[PDB]
């Protein structure tokens, strides 16, 4: 469920300003569910997914190579 989690987060970020998301204050912010730690967790996991998809594009250029080969024939 990583792609579905990222897109609604992507929709969540393009609808609300950064100052609002920063000054977000809710009374249930204590310990591990504090805003700093939650945002850090999302950032780290998204970094891992982003590195994976970068490797995927880098390997997906092979199809362009194969098309250029069939062009050469």
């Amino acid at each position: 469920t990583a792609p579905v989690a990222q897109r609604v987060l992507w929709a969540l970020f393009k609808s609300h300003p950064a100052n609002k998301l920063s000054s977000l204050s809710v009374k249930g912010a204590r310990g591990h569910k504090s805003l700093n730690e939650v945002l850090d967790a999302i950032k780290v996991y998204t970094e891992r997914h982003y590195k994976r998809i970068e490797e995927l594009v880098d390997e997906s250029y092979l199809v362009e190579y194969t098309l250029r080969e069939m062009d050469a024939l």
Binding site: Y50, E54, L56, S60, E64, L67
Partner: protein, 785 residues
């Protein structure tokens, strides 16, 4: 080694299982047979009994638009559709798990819905004999069904549920009682008003009206309270007039009329009945102007009342063919043509060949009954301490004698010659009356429970409350010997015809066979899961079977043993209540047994798999594009008509199907089977990969198997020609999906960096002083070596 068999069964009109129906006949439920009476004369029309079934019956339903076909629902979870013309079960439905409780019929009678106590409500088709489907809500058991099509139902969790049938899921719910239980359901025949009876004596009233938006069909238009604050058993409406009936399992039935809710529903009449009613039902008579309320009451009775509308009168009753509370003792006459049956409240004596009552009496309580020789008079010892003497010929009361003061006569035995009787009462004594006048008394240490003589009248045997048996001589009353060895008090005894054996039944769930000379326990034997209540031999050894004996036990069992081999020669099923008494034949050819049922009875490849999945998906895609061509040319009716496995899985697209079949296998197996795949099916695979990347889902799986395929077939792809178009398409789609996903996740990580910097800004510090020493995560990471 002859066995026994159920042959006759009688003494019971409607039991405590629910749902009587009226047709001018009353159709009611015995233990396991569904029997049909006339009410005008007490003679029953017929009985419906299936030999394959032994479980009790608990729900009855009459098919609308067509009588003469009836639905019964048993305890095992089975439904039987009977006919009334011929008395056979035309069909059977065995789908539920346990305890059918409510039945309901369609307006056309093709569809039959059954709610059980396993909480599943199941609809049934009546022209294909299959279970249609299986609805499922209801945290706890369902108590009411109705057909509005639409379905209405209600269950013990105080839930009222309105189900669709076109799309098998619930449309609307409501909760009637907040902390209580919705117990009974009543629907007006025009489907406009619905009332639900809840446990506090409440009746909640609901108005009806005859999907993406907010749907609201049921409306709680209010609440009312009846008089009796009991568990309201049922609520039945009138088929024609504006009346209904509310009743709990109690002595009162409240009929109300239909004209706030406190105004629109008023109390018409409160009918008082003799005993606790189990199920009321409605009856309209052709040519009457009144309301035939037909009650079935738990104390074994049918009553039929007239109610006047714009007081009550007990018009008709069916009580004669059965006792009315609970049969406690049986004794059959010496010629074995009649028996006497003793119950709390009455005595009834019956002819066996006609299985029919001939005489009756009123007695208060009834512990023991026994006829005197010459089968003219019958003795009853009763709990108030009395012995009454009645007779068959004059049908009156002859004599009353106060044997014991306030102590129940637990044992009554006639001398084998037939000149005296012995009463063992709940006092510390036992009395000997000959005829009646007191010959002699016997003072014993504890309470006496049961006693019997020797068939050659030589010695008497009593069974006390000390968990002991004392056997005395008959001439003088000297203690001959005694039997111990039981942990709980002996409840019954019987000794053999030649006085060579005593069988003794305790409350310790076991019996003993004693040798009656020196009192040696020939065998202890445990044979019943509960307390063994009564035990009797068969007297006549002229068939060569005098050492055989029956044992009636509170776990609903008769067990037929032989003492010489010490072995159980038969097990007799057929009772569903804790059997209270039995008696044998003096010819020994049959026996009778009287239960708590208030009945008596008389007994005489992974690669190949994804290859096939690819082929199926490609054929489905060919059909979908051809159907798209058809609907493009004209909007006429042309069905897609896909594969039965697709329409069985639920009309998911072939892309979802092949995604499941590519996901299900482990990744090492994925590598191996994708290697196994031949080049012929590679174009199909490339088509599906193009369609995945077009409708992006599982793009890492998409990419990894596309790369595996291209690298293990790179020379064939560059030499082929047809792959050019499909590979252009898959390159464009994969690049579009990867660019989209990479852009979104890069936006996410950039926005997260910005908001984390702003959070650090907001949370840096406020005061400023000499101490900036106050300005991270740590993990443990123990390593063993």
């Amino acid at each position: 080694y002859l066995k026994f068999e159920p042959s006759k069964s009688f003494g019971v009109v409607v039991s405590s299982n629910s749902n009587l129906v009226w047709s001018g006949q009353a159709i009611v439920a015995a233990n396991e047979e569904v029997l049909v009476w006339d009410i005008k004369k007490g003679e029953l029309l017929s009985r419906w009994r299936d030999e394959n079934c032994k479980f009790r019956v608990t729900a009855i339903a009459q098919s609308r638009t067509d009588p003469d076909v009836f639905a019964v629902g048993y305890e095992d979870g089975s439904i039987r559709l009977w006919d009334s013309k011929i008395a056979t079960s035309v069909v059977s439905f065995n789908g539920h798990k346990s305890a059918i409780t409510v039945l309901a019929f369609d307006k056309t009678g093709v569809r039959l819905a059954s709610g059980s106590k396993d909480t599943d409500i199941i609809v049934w088709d009546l022209v294909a004999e299959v279970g249609q489907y299986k609805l499922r809500g209801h945290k706890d058991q369902v108590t009411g069904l109705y057909f509005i099509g639409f379905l209405l139902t209600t269950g013990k969790d105080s839930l009222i549920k309105l189900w669709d049938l076109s799309s098998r899921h619930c449309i609307e719910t409501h909760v009637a009682q907040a902390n209580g239980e919705c117990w009974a359901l009543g629907v007006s025949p025009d489907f406009t008003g619905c009332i639900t009876a809840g446990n506090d004596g409440e009746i909640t009233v609901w108005a009806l009206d005859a999907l993406s938006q907010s749907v609201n069909f049921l409306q709680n238009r209010g609440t009312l309270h009846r008089s009796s604050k009991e568990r309201a058993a049922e609520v039945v409406f009138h088929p024609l007039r504006d009346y209904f009936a509310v009743h709990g399992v109690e002595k009162s039935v409240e009929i109300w009329r239909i004209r706030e809710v406190s105004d629109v529903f008023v109390q018409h009449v409160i009918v008082r009945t003799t005993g606790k009613v189990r199920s009321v039902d409605w009856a309209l008579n052709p040519g009457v102007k009144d309301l035939q309320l037909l009650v079935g009451g738990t104390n074994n009775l049918l009553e039929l009342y007239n109610i006047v509308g714009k007081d009550y009168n007990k018009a008709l009753a069916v009580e004669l063919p059965g006792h009315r509370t609970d049969i406690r003792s049986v004794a059959i006459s010496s010629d074995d043509k009649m028996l006497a049956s003793a119950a709390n409240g009455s005595l009834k004596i019956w002819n066996i060949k006609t299985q029919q009552c001939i005489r009756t009496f009123d007695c208060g309580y009834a512990l023991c009954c026994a006829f005197l020789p010459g089968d003219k008079v019958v003795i009853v010892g009763t709990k108030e301490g009395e012995l009454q003497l009645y007779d068959v010929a004059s049908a009156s009361l002859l004599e009353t004698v106060n044997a014991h003061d306030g102590h129940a006569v637990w044992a009554l035995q006639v001398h084998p010659d037939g000149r005296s009787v012995v009463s063992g009462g709940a006092d510390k004594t036992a009395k000997f009356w000959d005829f009646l006048v007191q010959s002699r008394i016997l003072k014993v240490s504890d309470d006496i429970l049961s006693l019997r003589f020797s068939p050659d009248a030589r010695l008497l045997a009593v069974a006390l409350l000390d968990s002991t048996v004392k056997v005395f001589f008959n001439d003088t009353l000297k203690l001959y010997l005694n039997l111990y060895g039981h942990k709980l008090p002996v409840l019954s005894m019987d000794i053999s015809y030649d006085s060579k054996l005593i069988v003794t039944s305790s409350a310790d769930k076991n019996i003993r066979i004693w040798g009656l000379d020196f009192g040696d326990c020939h065998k202890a034997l445990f044979g019943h899961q509960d307390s063994i209540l009564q035990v009797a031999f068969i007297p006549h050894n002229s068939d060569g079977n005098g050492h055989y004996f029956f044992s009636a036990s509170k776990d609903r069992t008769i067990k037929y043993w032989d003492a010489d081999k010490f072995e159980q020669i038969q097990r007799i099923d057929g009772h569903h209540g804790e059997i209270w008494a039995l008696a044998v034949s003096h010819s020994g050819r049959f026996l009778v047994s009287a239960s708590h049922d208030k009945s008596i009875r008389v007994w005489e490849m992974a690669g190949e798999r994804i290859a096939e999945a690819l082929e199926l998906g490609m054929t489905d895609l060919n059909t979908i594009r051809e159907w798209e061509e058809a609907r493009q040319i004209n909007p006429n009716i042309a069905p897609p008509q896909r594969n039965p496995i697709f329409v069985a899985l639920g009309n998911i697209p072939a892309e979802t199907y092949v995604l499941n079949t590519l996901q299900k296998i482990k990744p090492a197996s994925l590598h191996d089977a994708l290697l196994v795949l031949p080049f012929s099916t590679i174009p199909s695979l490339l088509t599906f990969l193009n369609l995945f990347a077009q409708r992006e889902l599982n793009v890492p799986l998409t990419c990894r198997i596309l790369f595996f395929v291209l690298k293990t077939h790179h020379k064939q792809i560059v030499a082929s020609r047809t792959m050019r178009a499909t590979l252009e398409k898959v390159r464009a789609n994969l690049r579009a999906a990867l660019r989209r996903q990479k852009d979104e996740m890069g936006f996410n990580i950039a926005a997260l960096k910005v908001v984390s910097m702003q959070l650090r800004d907001k949370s840096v510090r406020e005061y400023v002083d000499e101490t900036w020493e106050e300005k991270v995560r740590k993990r443990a990471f123990a390593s063993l070596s």
